UniProtKB/Swiss-Prot annotation:
The entry's keywords: ATP-binding, Cadmium resistance, Membrane, Nucleotide-binding, Phosphoprotein, Repeat, Translocase, Transmembrane, Transmembrane helix, Transport, Vacuole
Chain positions with Phosphoserine modification: S235
PANTHER family (UniProt xref): ATP-BINDING CASSETTE SUB-FAMILY C, MULTIDRUG-RESISTANCE LIKE PROTEIN 1, ISOFORM I
Function summary: Cooperates for the ATP-dependent vacuolar transport of bilirubin and glutathione conjugates.
Name of the protein in its database record: Metal resistance protein YCF1
Topology versus the membrane: Multi-pass membrane protein
Record-annotated membrane-spanning stretches: 24-44, 65-85, 91-111, 122-142, 161-181, 263-283, 318-338, 395-415, 419-439, 503-523, 545-565, 840-860, 898-919, 963-983, 985-1005, 1077-1097, 1102-1122
The species this protein was found in: Saccharomyces cerevisiae (strain ATCC 204508 / S288c) (Baker's yeast)
Enzyme class at the top of the EC tree: translocase
EC number: 7.2.2.2, 7.6.2.3
Domain ABC transmembrane type-1: 271-562, 847-1131
Location of the ABC transporter domain: 598-824, 1162-1396
Length: 1396
């Protein structure tokens, strides 16, 4: 049985708030000494063993100071034992812990020295030993001093006090000299080693190893070279080898394999450690409310004893406050080690499963690779593995969720009686309601994005057709249609989405209040005891803690089942059947040219797909290929021509006979494959560079011409999906790679079919034939082109998957068979101007009303808690609940006031602030874009333009307002939390100001560096999936060249780069979270200790501390919320920046001017213009005069300004000098709409819009049905619309479809031209995209409809203008040409004459 010799019991906590002497001696210091014995001896043995040379550090002042301070510790502890040898030395705890401490100090003395020369990391055991010695000696000092001040005696005598003080100082000193110093290395472009490897245990706990990266990312934009290389054991190769080594046991040792247990057996140790840390976190998180109760109960007891033996000591209050600090600090320290371990396991599963998926893909049989799509497999890597990575984050909540709920319910039951259950019932009831509301939120988000995509497609129509749209002056009708869709569908849906977010926010405000209100009501009306202030506020904290597990458990279960589905998919993948690696036994080279066989088969059989096929395989092949000779395979499509090459390559399952291929082999597929990259990289294909042979290959292959043609030579980028090249040069490039590889055996699967016959005759001479450079290498070629047969040394012909005839060219010629007949940066400041621009859009009065209702909601919530404080103090003054009805009514009134204020908050946000701003910005951007000059639409791609209408406007609509709302909610909540704490203890100002400085410091560092790191992570994430898809495309050639090792290594490098960017990404979240939770725990310490000082001053009530700490406990969550929301606001507000940079675009000339037109000659006056303001004068000093009915043909060189004439006449480009006159009025001042809508055109780029024929003919609806039908009838596609549908004029054209082919599309444009008053008409050909039928119809329609009005024709086909009575040739932009086409053709050897 337990026994002791001190009046204070052996129990942990004494009458005062500190640990009792016999617990500090008997448990804390004894156990820390024994910890050092055990684990320090273990570490001492390991470090003495492991190394003795090379890495050793310099014996600087650091080590000597450490050793000296340890010696001082031995001095003071021996002196302690001396000072206790007679003062009741019978106390086993004291004497035994002195003995243990002395032995442990000897062990530490040894361990310091043996560490210093060996380890880079300050030893973990030594650091924890000094932490526990410092804490134990400090607790002993506190004990001795408390008993001095309260009982007048020193347990260890006054000498013992000073001696323990010295022990405390020396332990803290050596603790710091162990933790801080870096142990200088004793001196003798890739990324630097990860700091995590060097971080000692305290640095690892506090994530102070991230601080360097956070500072660097705060001061400069991070390029991937700023990241540190990945930690010690994070390599994808190592992790995939581990997982494979276990998965092999699953496959071969178990009766039935399980990939889930492979993953568990591999990575479960980290998850067990994380589970331990999570359990400690749960325990501490629910001790914190118990310390809150203890403090409130202490305050009430103290005040009740000071109002009118062993009166309660204030040091108990101070020690309760400091225990709350320690609880918070240990919560954060263990919580973030839990997050570290689970996220590390997630990254392990990611980088392990990704590399295993790649490696398995390399080994997949073509059977499985056909059985599953490339997209499915790349999604297996991209998404299914993602579910398993995400699963780690939630896995421990499978038990920690219930564990928090179980102990939270126990705590609430013990605190609040059975009335707990009404609050628990409310939470449980609101969980399904939360799911229902979130399902509606998802539905409306889906509908809103559907509307967004619809309106984005309308925008795409407008943008891609902007040329014709501006020319026809159709800007107004299409912009009004866009506005109609916007305002009537997208914003209409957005108002409803806002209303339901308002409902959701009302719920999230009221339910946390409502649980406590209802449980206090049931308590008051069912419990015969006072609803005291030590019940109300701990109950609030406990319900707050209960909310999270209950509301997150559904998400955890969802993730668990979804990851189970993903595991199923991965397991099916890994078990797919493989290549039968011994199908073709590869063998080394053979020297003697010409004679020896290289490829062999002896009546062998090769199946395509095993389980269905037998006696239908490619079979009975007896085959020979021999060094240096070219042997050609012939066969009909599907005959097995490709199959035989696949066999000798090794892609097919054989069951009879044997096959072999000697030496290395190179392979060219019938369909060429080009990995994205430079043409040089595609040719070299991982082989070392030899310039002479590289150029020799480019010359022997006809690739030289293409290599000269392409815009950047061999550095020309084969872009995503290989769009940069066409089929012929693609096949040529594949052959170039094959040649460069200089393999010993060549398997040319029909390269020549994709090549012009002349280029094939070049290739066969330079490469394939004996005259080629490959004459010394074995070549098998599979083509039916007769030239290969003519050059081939020996021939085989196969059909039905069977070899039919084989022999040398001589025998196959003599046989007269069918083959014989054929063959014979620093970071910038925050862009506050954009924030103010968004506020201006939101109607600053409206945004101020929003902030006002934030203030009112938080104010009424705070006054709800203040009324709860008053009510609980009233019940504490009484022995019962005096006016339950009144107090509950007022508390309910204040809580509901807060909830309704939040409802009005969100209604204002959406209906007045966010939706108004979204409409303003969209109208401004679209209006400015459409009135932008062509400079804009030509200098910026339609993709980038459409991106602002698609994504940036969407973010402003649906994310930015929500994020500002959350930011201001949490900022106001923190402001009111600080206000409450300061009102309770005004001296808290001096604590919150320094902590404010630290908070802003960390928040800024995180805001910058986290955006940088997430950017790098997302950038480096995609190359993994794109590379995997590329390899899946090239899977056959990757095996063919037999450089699976190189491709797998490239994949592992992609994975390692992604992790190199990701590991900082989330360790920055750990860094921030640790800082913010440390700040929160220091805030709790400040509030608690200042409240206890106010108690010492005799002016604190229990309710004041209850309220102050109810808020101080929650402040740490709002701090993280504020930081996260600043991050998200900064990421979204660039949307408003990107929108504004278009909304202020330089607009073209004024649309309408006072020179309004009253309603056909054209005259130029020294006119000149540029195709761009920055380019030179492409059109110079024209003065042509054109008579009212005159037909004018325009001709010129390919670089002449003839094309710019139509742009000039429509004033789509302004006059550099001079002007243009129409009907004796200068158009240069007439206004763009008034000008353009009065001229006909058939634009060179015929363009169509979605909608009725009406919308593509008369979108303004300004012309009559009879006239529209007349135009369609004249343009000879009345018939086409009637064939399309019975809707006739309402028949619908679609963008991206093919309702109207180009010719009838030009007739549609001609109809558009016919409707408008054609006093002037302009037309141009689709450049070299016309036919004689389209011509004749065009000219006959023009003669019919426009001959009586001016016509200007720019078409380059001269037949279109031979009949004109006037012609013009643009001599490089100087008009200088004469009247008639016939006169020009006859009177001189004109350019016109030369062209004709």
């Amino acid at each position: 049985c337990k026994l002791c010799r001190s009046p204070e019991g052996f129990g942990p906590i004494s009458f005062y708030g500190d640990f009792t002497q016999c617990f500090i001696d008997g448990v804390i210091l004894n156990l820390s000494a024994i910890f050092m014995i055990t684990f320090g001896i273990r570490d001492l043995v390991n470090l003495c063993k492991k190394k003795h040379s090379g890495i050793k550090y310099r014996r600087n002042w650091i080590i000597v100071s450490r050793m000296a301070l340890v010696l001082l510790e031995i001095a003071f502890v021996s002196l302690a034992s001396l000072n206790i040898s007679k003062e009741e030395a019978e106390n086993f705890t004291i004497v035994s812990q002195y003995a243990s401490t002395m032995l442990s100090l000897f062990v530490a003395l040894a361990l310091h020295w043996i560490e210093y020369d060996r380890s880079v990391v300050a030893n973990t055991v030594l650091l924890f030993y000094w932490l526990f010695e410092t804490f134990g000696n400090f607790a002993k000092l506190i004990n001795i001093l408390i008993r001095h001040t309260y009982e007048g005696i020193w347990y260890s005598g006054q000498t013992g006090f000073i001696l323990t003080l010295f022990q405390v100082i020396t332990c803290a000193s050596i603790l710091l000299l162990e933790a801080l110093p870096k142990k200088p290395l004793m001196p003798h472009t890739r990324r630097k080693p990860n700091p995590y490897d060097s971080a000692n245990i305290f640095s690892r706990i506090t994530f102070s190893w991230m601080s360097g990266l956070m500072k660097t990312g705060y001061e400069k934009y991070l390029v991937e070279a700023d990241l540190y290389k990945l930690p010690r054991n994070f390599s994808s190769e190592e992790l995939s080898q581990k997982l494979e080594k276990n998965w092999e046991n699953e496959l071969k040792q178990k009766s039935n394999p399980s990939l889930s247990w492979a993953i568990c057996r591999t990575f479960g140790s980290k998850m067990l450690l994380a589970a331990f840390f999570k359990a400690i976190h749960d325990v501490l998180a629910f001790t914190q409310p118990q310390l809150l109760r203890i403090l409130i109960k202490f305050v009430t007891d103290y005040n009740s004893e000071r109002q009118d033996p062993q009166k309660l000591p204030i040091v108990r209050g101070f020690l309760i406050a400091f225990a709350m600090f320690l609880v918070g600090f240990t919560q954060t320290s263990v919580l973030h080690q839990y997050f570290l371990n689970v996220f590390n396991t997630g990254m392990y599963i990611k980088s392990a499963l990704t590399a295993l998926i790649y490696q398995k893909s390399l080994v997949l049989s073509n059977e499985a690779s056909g059985l599953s799509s490339t997209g499915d497999i790349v999604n297996l890597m991209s998404v299914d593995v993602q579910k398993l990575q995400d699963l780690t984050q939630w896995l421990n909540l499978i038990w920690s969720g219930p564990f928090q709920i179980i102990i939270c319910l126990y705590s609430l039951y013990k605190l609040l009686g059975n009335s707990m259950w009404v609050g628990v019932i409310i939470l449980v009831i609101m969980m399904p309601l939360n799911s229902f509301l979130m399902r509606i939120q998802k539905k409306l988000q889906k509908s809103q994005m559907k509307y967004k995509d619809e309106r984005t497609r309308v925008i795409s129509e407008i943008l891609n057709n902007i040329k014709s749209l501006k020319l026809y002056a159709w800007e107004k009708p299409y912009r009004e249609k866009l506005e109609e869709v916007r305002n009537n569908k997208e914003l209409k849906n957005l108002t409803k989405l806002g209303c339901y977010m308002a409902v959701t926010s009302f719920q999230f405000n009221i339910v946390p209040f409502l649980v406590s209100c209802c449980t206090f009501a049931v308590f008051v009306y069912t419990e015969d005891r006072a609803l005291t202030t030590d019940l109300v506020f701990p109950a609030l904290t406990l319900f707050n803690l209960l909310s999270f597990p209950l509301m997150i458990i559904p998400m955890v279960l969802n993730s668990f089942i979804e990851a189970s589905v993903s595991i199923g998919r991965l397991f099916t993948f890994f078990t797919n059947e493989e290549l039968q690696p011994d199908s073709v036994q590869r063998l080394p080279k053979v020297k003697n040219i010409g004679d020896v066989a290289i490829n062999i088969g002896d009546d062998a059989t090769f199946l395509w797909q095993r389980k269905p096929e037998y006696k239908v395989a490619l079979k009975n092949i007896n085959f020979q290929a021999k060094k240096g000779n070219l042997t050609c395979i012939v066969g009909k499509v599907g005959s097995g021509k490709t199959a035989l090459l696949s066999c000798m390559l090794g892609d097919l399952f054989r069951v009879k006979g044997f096959a072999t291929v000697h030496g290395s082999v190179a392979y060219v597929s019938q369909v060429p494959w080009i990995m994205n990259g430079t043409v040089k990289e595609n040719i070299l294909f991982g082989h070392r560079y030899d310039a002479e042979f590289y150029e020799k290959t480019i010359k022997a292959c006809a690739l030289t011409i293409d290599l000269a043609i392409l815009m950047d030579g061999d550095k020309t980028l084969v872009g995503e999906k290989g769009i940069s090249l066409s089929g012929g040069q693609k096949a040529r490039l594949s052959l170039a790679r094959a040649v460069y590889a200089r393999a010993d055996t060549y398997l040319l699967d029909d390269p020549l079919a994709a090549v012009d016959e002349h280029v094939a005759r070049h290739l066969i001479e330079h490469v394939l034939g004996p005259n080629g450079l490959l004459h010394t290498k074995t070549k098998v070629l599979a083509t039916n082109k007769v030239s290969a047969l003519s050059i081939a040394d020996s021939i085989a012909l196969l059909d039905n998957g069977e070899i039919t005839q084989q022999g040398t060219y001589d025998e196959i010629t003599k046989d007269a068979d069918s083959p014989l007949w054929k063959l014979l940066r620093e970071q910038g400041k925050v862009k506050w101007n954009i924030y103010l621009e968004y506020a201006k859009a939101c109607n600053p009065k409206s945004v101020c009303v929003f902030i006002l209702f934030i203030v009112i909601s938080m104010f009424l919530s705070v006054m709800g808690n203040v009324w709860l404080k008053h009510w609980s103090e009233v019940n504490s003054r009484y022995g019962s609940n005096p006016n339950a009805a009144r107090y509950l009514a007022i508390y309910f009134a204040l809580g509901i006031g807060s909830a309704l204020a939040t409802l009005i908050q969100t209604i204002v946000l959406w209906v007045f602030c966010t939706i108004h701003a979204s409409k303003y910005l969209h109208n401004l951007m679209t209006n400015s874009v459409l009135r932008a000059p062509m400079t804009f639409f030509e200098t910026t791609p339609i993709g980038r333009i459409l991106n602002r209408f698609s994504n940036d406007i969407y973010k402003v609509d649906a994310l930015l307002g929500r994020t500002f709302s959350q930011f201001f909610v949490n900022a106001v909540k923190v402001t009111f939390t600080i206000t409450v704490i300061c009102a309770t203890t005004w001296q808290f100002i001096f604590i919150i100001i320094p902590l404010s400085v630290f908070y802003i410091y960390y928040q800024q560092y995180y805001l910058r560096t986290s955006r940088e790191l997430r950017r790098l992570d997302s950038i480096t994430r995609s190359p993994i999936y794109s590379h995997f898809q590329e390899t899946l495309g090239g899977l056959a050639t990757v095996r063919g060249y037999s450089q699976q090792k190189r491709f797998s290594h490239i994949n592992q490098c992609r994975i390692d780069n992604n992790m190199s960017a990701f590991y900082p990404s989330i360790n920055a979240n750990r860094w921030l979270a640790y800082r913010l939770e440390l700040i929160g725990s220091i805030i709790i310490l400040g509030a608690a200790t200042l409240s206890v000082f106010r108690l010492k001053q005799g002016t604190l009530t229990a309710g004041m501390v209850g309220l102050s700490l109810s808020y101080a406990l929650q402040i740490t969550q709002t701090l993280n919320w504020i930081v996260r929301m600043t991050v998200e606001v900064e990421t979204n507000i660039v949307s408003v920046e990107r929108i504004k940079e278009y909304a202020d675009l330089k607009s073209e000339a004024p649309l309408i001017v006072e020179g309004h037109r009253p309603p056909g000659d054209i005259k130029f006056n020294n006119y000149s213009t540029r195709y761009r303001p920055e380019l030179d004068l492409v059109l110079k000093h024209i003065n042509i005069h054109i008579k009212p009915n005159e037909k004018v043909g325009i001709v010129g060189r390919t670089g002449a300004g003839k094309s710019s004439l139509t742009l000039a006449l429509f004033r789509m480009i302004e006059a550099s000098e001079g002007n243009i006159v129409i009907d004796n009025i200068a158009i240069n001042e007439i206004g763009l709409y008034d000008l353009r809508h009065k001229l006909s055109i058939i634009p060179q780029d015929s363009q169509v819009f979605e909608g009725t024929v009406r919308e593509n003919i008369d979108p303004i609806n300004q012309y009559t049905d009879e006239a529209i039908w007349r135009a369609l009838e004249l343009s000879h596609l009345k018939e086409h619309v009637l064939s399309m549908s019975n809707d006739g004029l309402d028949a619908q054209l679609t963008e991206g479809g093919g309702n109207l082919s180009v010719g009838q599309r030009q007739l549609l444009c001609l109809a558009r031209a016919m409707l408008v008053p054609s006093k002037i008409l302009v037309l141009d050909e689709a450049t070299a995209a016309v036919d004689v039928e389209t011509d004749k119809v065009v000219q006959e329609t023009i003669r019919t409809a426009f001959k009586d009005r001016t016509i200007l024709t720019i078409a380059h086909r001269l037949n279109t203008i031979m009949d004109s009575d006037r012609i013009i040739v643009l001599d490089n932009g100087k008009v200088a040409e004469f009247d008639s086409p016939g006169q020009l053709l006859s009177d001189n050897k004109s350019l016109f004459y030369s062209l004709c």
